[PDB]
């Protein structure tokens, strides 16, 4: 129930599909990431939930990802 | 070079209008959300961009003292477009050498000066800071840990591609290319000027570009003449130029010039960023000319999105604690 | 001869 842009929704989908489809020797899962499979699963759930984002309400003027 | 570069600078056939002319105050996050940063942008003045640059009469020698006289710098041989290396003192001597006494044409486009005294004298556009993956996705304690001011990969703790100094003598030319990893680029003409040829990242143009890379006939062919529409545009002193992901471009330097610019990935043009990475893969671009830790970064991007939206972390406990320590500062 | 990354150059 935050509203993302379609740019982000399509991009994150592209990212998920890309990363999931790489072989283990090309995946480059970084040291900081715990369980990449659980991460991928959570992204897919999120993209389903965010699919109905309203395009106008998405134009908040500040990014969703910001440091505290 | 098997083509005549001077006729490419004079002809009126590169008459496409791809570049949007914009005011700095309108280049904000809402603009990115609305447009996805798909259009090349020129800001004829810096008002509202939030940039900062060095002393207007800053010299290559001043750059040398900031980054270190003995720092090895990657230099381009303009005639072959191959890379050579020399120290910053030697580069400075070259730049200070009278034109007539320089037996070769050399260009520096790749001096990344983060973690030197020069870094605080250059501030990127504010909007770039809001959207750049390095600043907003890469673990902060890793980025803050960087001590090495060179781009030595074994010492590199994050993708060190944010702040570059370009030093180009009259007559320099950089042939058509797409910036690494499909990064977008900002470019500020501190002193001098530049001429760009721009080719849009259509499926067909990207196919041609890739075939051109694989053909071994690149010095032999001017890519601007192989495509349907190409824009040649001049950037004057004080202009800021933003180039979107995937844009195929070449650059000529009509006078001695000093430029500050940098690369960034962002969340609003991911498909094109990945497209470009795959072209690099297929054309066997060596690792050194690519965006460092590209897929690592992509992983961190997914984690950040899940965390900011759902409050569920996919970082290790130790990385979460490092992040909380940063938050308490 | 340390390996480098993020060198900007046409390929
Ligand atoms: O200014 C130049 O010669 C080249 C700029 C550029 O497009 C690059 O270095 O990636
Ligand atoms: Ni470039």
TrEMBL record, chain A:
Superkingdom, natural source: Eukaryota
Subcellular location(s) of the protein: Nucleus
Annotated family: Belongs to the JHDM1 histone demethylase family.
Protein's name according to its UniProt entry: [histone H3]-dimethyl-L-lysine(36) demethylase
Organism whose genome encodes this protein: Mus musculus
Parent-record interval covered: 450 to 517 of 1161
């Amino acid at each position: 129930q935050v509203h993302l842009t379609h740019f982000e929704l399509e991009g994150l989908r592209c990212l998920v599909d890309k990363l999931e489809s790489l072989p283990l020797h090309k995946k480059c899962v970084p040291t900081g990431i715990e369980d990449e499979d659980a991460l991928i699963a959570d992204v897919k759930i999120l993209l389903e939930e965010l699919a109905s984002s309203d395009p106008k309400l998405a134009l908040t003027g500040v990014p969703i990802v910001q440091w505290p | 070079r098997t083509f005549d570069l001077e006729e490419k600078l004079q002809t009126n056939k590169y008459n496409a209008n791809f570049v949007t002319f914009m005011e700095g105050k309108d280049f904000n996050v809402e603009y990115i959300q609305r447009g996805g940063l798909r259009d090349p942008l020129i800001f004829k003045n810096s008002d509202g961009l939030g940039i900062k640059m060095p002393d207007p009469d800053f010299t290559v020698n001043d750059v040398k003292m900031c980054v270190g006289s003995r720092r090895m710098v990657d230099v381009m041989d303009v005639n072959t477009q191959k890379g050579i290396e020399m120290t910053m003192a030697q580069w400075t001597r070259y730049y200070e050498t009278p034109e007539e006494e320089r037996e070769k044409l050399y260009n520096v486009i790749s001096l990344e000066f983060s973690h030197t005294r020069l870094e605080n004298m250059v501030q990127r556009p504010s909007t770039v800071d809001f959207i750049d993956w390095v600043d907003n996705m890469w673990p902060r304690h890793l980025k803050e840990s960087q001590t090495e001011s060179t781009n030595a990969i074994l010492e590199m703790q994050y993708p060190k591609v944010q702040k570059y100094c370009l030093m180009s003598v009259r007559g320099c030319y950089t042939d058509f290319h797409v910036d690494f990893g499909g990064t977008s680029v900002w470019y500020h003409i501190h002193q001098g000027g530049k001429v760009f040829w721009l080719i849009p990242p259509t499926a067909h143009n990207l196919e041609l570009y890739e075939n051109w890379l694989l053909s071994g006939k690149q010095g032999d062919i001017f890519l601007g003449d192989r495509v349907s529409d190409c824009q040649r545009i001049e950037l004057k002193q004080g202009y800021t130029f933003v180039i979107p992901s995937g844009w195929i471009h070449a650059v000529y330097t009509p006078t001695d010039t000093l430029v500050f610019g940098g690369n960034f990935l962002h969340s609003f043009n991911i498909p094109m960023q990945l497209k470009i990475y795959s072209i690099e893969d297929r054309t066997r671009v060596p690792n050194k000319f690519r965006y460092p830790f590209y897929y690592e970064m992509c992983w961190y991007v997914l984690e950040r999105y899940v965390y900011c939206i759902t409050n569920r972390s996919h970082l290790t406990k130790d990385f979460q604690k490092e992040s909380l320590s940063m938050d308490m500062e | 001869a340390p390996a480098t990354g993020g060198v900007k150059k046409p390929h």
